[PDB]
Fold this protein.
Amino acid sequence: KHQGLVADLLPNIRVMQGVGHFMFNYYSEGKKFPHRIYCIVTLLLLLLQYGMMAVNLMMESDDVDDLTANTITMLFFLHPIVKMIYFPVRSKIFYKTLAIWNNPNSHPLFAESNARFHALAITKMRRLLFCVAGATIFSVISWTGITFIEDSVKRITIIPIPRLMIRTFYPFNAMSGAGHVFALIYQFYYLVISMAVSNSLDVLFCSWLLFACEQLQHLKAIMKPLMELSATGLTKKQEMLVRSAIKYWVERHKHVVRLVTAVGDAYGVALLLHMLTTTITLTLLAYQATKVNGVNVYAATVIGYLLYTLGQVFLFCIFGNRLIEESSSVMEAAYSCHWYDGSEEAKTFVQIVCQQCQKAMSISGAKFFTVSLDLFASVLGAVVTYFMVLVQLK
Amino acid sequence: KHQGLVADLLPNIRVMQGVGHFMFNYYSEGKKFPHRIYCIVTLLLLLLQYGMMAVNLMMESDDVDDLTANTITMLFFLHPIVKMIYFPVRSKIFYKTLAIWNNPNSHPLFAESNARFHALAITKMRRLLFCVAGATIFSVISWTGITFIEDSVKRITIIPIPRLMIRTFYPFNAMSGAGHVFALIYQFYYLVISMAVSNSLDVLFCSWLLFACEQLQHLKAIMKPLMELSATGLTKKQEMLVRSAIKYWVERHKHVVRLVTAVGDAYGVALLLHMLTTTITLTLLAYQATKVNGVNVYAATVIGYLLYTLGQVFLFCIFGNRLIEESSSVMEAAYSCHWYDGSEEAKTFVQIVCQQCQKAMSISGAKFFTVSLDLFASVLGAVVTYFMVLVQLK
Amino acid sequence: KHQGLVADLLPNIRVMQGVGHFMFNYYSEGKKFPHRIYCIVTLLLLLLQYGMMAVNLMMESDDVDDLTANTITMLFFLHPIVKMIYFPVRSKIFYKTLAIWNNPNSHPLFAESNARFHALAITKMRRLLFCVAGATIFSVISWTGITFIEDSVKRITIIPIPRLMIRTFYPFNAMSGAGHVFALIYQFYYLVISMAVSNSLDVLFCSWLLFACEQLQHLKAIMKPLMELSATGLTKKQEMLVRSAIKYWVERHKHVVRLVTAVGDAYGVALLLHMLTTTITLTLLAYQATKVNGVNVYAATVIGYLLYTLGQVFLFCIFGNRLIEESSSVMEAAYSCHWYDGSEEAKTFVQIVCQQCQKAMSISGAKFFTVSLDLFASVLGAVVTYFMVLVQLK
Amino acid sequence: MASILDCPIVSVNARVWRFWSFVLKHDAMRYISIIPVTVMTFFMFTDLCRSWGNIQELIIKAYFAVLYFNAVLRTLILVKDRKLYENFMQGISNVYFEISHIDDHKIQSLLKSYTVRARMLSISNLALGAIISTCFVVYPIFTGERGLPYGMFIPGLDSFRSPHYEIIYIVQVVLTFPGCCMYIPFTSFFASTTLFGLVQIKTLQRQLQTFKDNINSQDKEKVKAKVVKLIEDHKRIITYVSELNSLVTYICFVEFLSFGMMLCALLFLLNVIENHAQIVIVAAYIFMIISQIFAFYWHANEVREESMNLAEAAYSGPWVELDNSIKKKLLLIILRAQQPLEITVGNVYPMTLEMFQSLLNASYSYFTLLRRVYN
């Protein structure tokens, strides 16, 4: 928790560790043992509740509406389990990523801009972390509240169903005092930890992307005065200075590309899995929305599920698109300087940089797609079109 | 209304202000206070009538056909309200754009082409303004005429609905004289102002694009003789002259890029909302057209709605596509000159320009799409496909 | 069996010849005559059984479910016949492709990397061959096992049909000892030979692509030290050394391009035919999956058909995508070296290589499409969408 | 300075257009060709409007209505811009003459093969159109029941009662000939022009790969002149493609819009026929529509692909040993060549086999969903 990219993301790492996200790497070995057991217990509890949900779906399968609702809950809560298992197996790549920026480049003339944009990146990471934390807290509170204001009955005659926040089969009574209170506390803890693990991993991905984008902005900002450094018909010392500046620029650009590739590997597999789950989730949600008839609780729940799913997709897409735009803008900022006064070497460097920036940096879901606002727009269009088809056929 | 890009657009600005489109920036302070009041009143009236339509939709919701008709009218008239409210909140970026070309570059040798293409841009802007104004006037006249020929009766037995140009709920009698006349005049004013508001904002967007395209044409036209100037084995003075020509070309290209980015910022989000409303409008219109059976009044109304909607989309797409094609043509025109005879400096200039022109300038609807004739084609194909699905399933 | 690309792929060629895949080119003339006869017999038998299948589909046409099943089997087994006939007519281009790499380039400094990456390519080809062979054997075993555990009965009432692995009309009893046993052995042979033929041609295509990718990797790996060789003011001998290194690099790149073009021709027509058949197969399979109700045998058969079809498509797409990404990576690895410290010649070489690699190498199905993971993604989306529409319309 | 009729690639088509006096001569044949066909097409459209209570008759007549409407549109646009086509074919002839004098076995065989393919494709197109048209005009005889080859509806005229029927049939068959004469040669001309574009592109590729032959490296003037000539040839090809684009662009936009509109109804009608012989006619219609669209798209795609491969042709040259300046010039040639020389349909959609594949996928999906819903 001392060197770059782990000193910047340290609050994120601490939140991930606290929520039960393994990652036994960034503290004294004294905490290595205790922390570990905690993680296991959390997973156990998660799976336990998950299992208790799945069993409930078995005898709820007689009908179709309850089956669809149960399946949507099952996938919504499948996301955190997949993320929690995915991190430990791929932990070597995650640590390799987090150790990329330990030893970065340095030039005397571009130190001020480097510091400014590093600080700006840290600030934006903190802002994103706090925003997503607030969103998850709001989601948990809304879930609990809507569970408490709805009517807990089942359609068969009227059958009283336990007033629980997540449908589940419990050996406990789940109706009287002790069972009901224990179930409520357990389900609250579940919700909180599941949302926390899922969103912590997602926010780590997005924070990596934020750092990359801020480094690209620093590159452009110093691209502007680099040429003026070259433009002056240069003495030997000036030639060496221009060579050093070009070296710094190119090496930092390559460093940014390295970071992007590492992030791409790890969370590319992660995003492939995420969207594979989200597709079925959204299909079932479109069918469920076909059933809305103005009721507050039913519509509230359906729109909440849709909002959460599309919000996760939208976060990934926002930051992927930002990386793409930043690389293309690197091209544009390479063009828009005073290269017509620079020496031949500086102009050649400009040409090669503009060649490189012809393709935008991007993160792909294991080569099957890219994360961009185009992907989000396509997902939205697909779900809307499927809903229209469903209403027409009905 | 003195310096560039506001003197050129000044007729458009006056038309926007006259209809009640705010724009408290381009006249003497004496007119500041009265004009503002007028704007507010206009908005009020609009909303008033708008509300009176919404109320009408509430008690006309028992059936589905009249519900669809009312929804289509409501979205059609939602467009002006969104535009009207959207300008003032973003007025700062708009004023930033209109002041972009106040202090442009200039070279002694390339002045004639600049003047010629500036004049051509002004003429095309005026032509576009007049064409769209005529289109709106024709639209309102057709609306009034069709409303007068048709039979004002609503299905139940037979019940005579008030003979009005827009279905609306009024406290007045709306059947005898005074109410009928007041409603007719009020609805005529509402139509005129709504269409004028929406189309004025759209025409300002398109005129920005026109100016950018004409500046690109100027850049290509002077690209042709720039190399001839460079090609000549040059002396010091000729080296300075070619350097100045390259500086002029590059800086003017960068200025055009700045204008395009500013135009994207200002009107980026307006296009997104426009297409968001359109999608729903066109879906409802496809369902409505499914019901056509050869009746002149019904078919005429449906055809008018579809024509207006697709015409707005088509205007945006036409001018976005023109910008895209003009930038690509910059690439082509950079290639097709005697660059193989120019000095090494001019050859490197051509290389960098051709690298830059690989990607076409474009305007995007908040990064969710680009405005091009491809977008209009896709919209048309989607609506046609949905109509086919509706008819087949019927 | 002695020159490059046929010494490396010799096990694949032997597997091809063994299953009756013509290829009368890489053995002593003593085997030229007998082998030919063998091929013919195999083809005959295949066609015979194939015909024996089609005849059955004629009297199974009164119902539509068995018609769909028979059509799916017929297309599945049409794949190997088409491949088997397709090779001999196009054998000239196949031999031309196999004889591409007989006289490579050579440089003293880049011999180590060349040998290393050649060995790596050979190992990967062997791995791919073994993996696909195992998959084919598993598929045959699963087919036979499923045929034996299921119930051989037809609905008319209950009618006992012959217990055969492929439904077929035979002149014999096909129920008692002799007929049943002969039919079982004949059908086992038919399955083994058909799957081996198809998959062996596919594996040869993919092995060509693997070789191309490994050669690109060698090119990047040696790109890295070439620039350093250039960077040192270079004496005459050093300049000649740099030029020789650049010549070697360029010539090897062109050689890889030639190989890619040849592979593209031959198996591009092949893949056009392949995916033409696969589309209809997947449509019928979607309709079949619509009927699944949890029964092990039926669901197992449908899942196996889908898995085999999508596995073939996925193999082609994986290796096409690898080629595309490898060429783009060549661009990136050309950028990421110490070119700023080089001489003018090396910098120009870097510029031209980066410009060339802008458009990636790829294989197309006769220009109709490209083989990439995007093609597989589109195929999967199409089949899933069709299935969803089918279930809704039911 | 050769002649339009002397160039083997464009001769046949020009001759046909010369026979009907559209492009090269202004005799009276133009009006006798155009006026009767346009009048017949108008009467076909009137018959379409009249007879629409039976979708089968509507579609069977509408196919020919749209076919001859497209014929009329093509011939009108041709006569309107005869000068542009004439100058384009004259440039084709001049460049053909220039290429034929190149002393290189590869280029000569390339030119010969493409000229042969162009002429064979044109003659084929013509013969196929003639045979299909004759089959359609004779089809009603077997049907009986006083059916006309195409639609026709003159107000207040019983066209199927009196010897009227006979004279209407005769005039229809006679007017068949000029109509096909105006329709097919545009497709043939597009094929031939695209083929000559490919000929020019491949000649330039060969010249790029073998430009340094017979030139001494010491004298940079000759190398500079050769690269200048290569650049000028590339510009020539670009201009050729741009003009061919504009023309075929507008005409093909109209044609493809009409063809898609007709194909939708044809797919609809496919699964509603119970006649057992009208389905054969429907399949034939689909075959001709798809074949024409495929011809257009295939030739446009080949132009695009060869234009792109010009970049690889530039890369594979002897540029390692040339002076730096020539390397930069080849770098610019590679830069420009990577943009395909597309032939856009309406200036909206580039014509490529990807677009044709997309149309095919749309048609397949539409037919499958139609068959499913109609069950």
Residues 10-393 of chain C form one domain. Chain C touches chain A through 22 residues (CB under 8 Å). Chain C has one domain: 10-393.
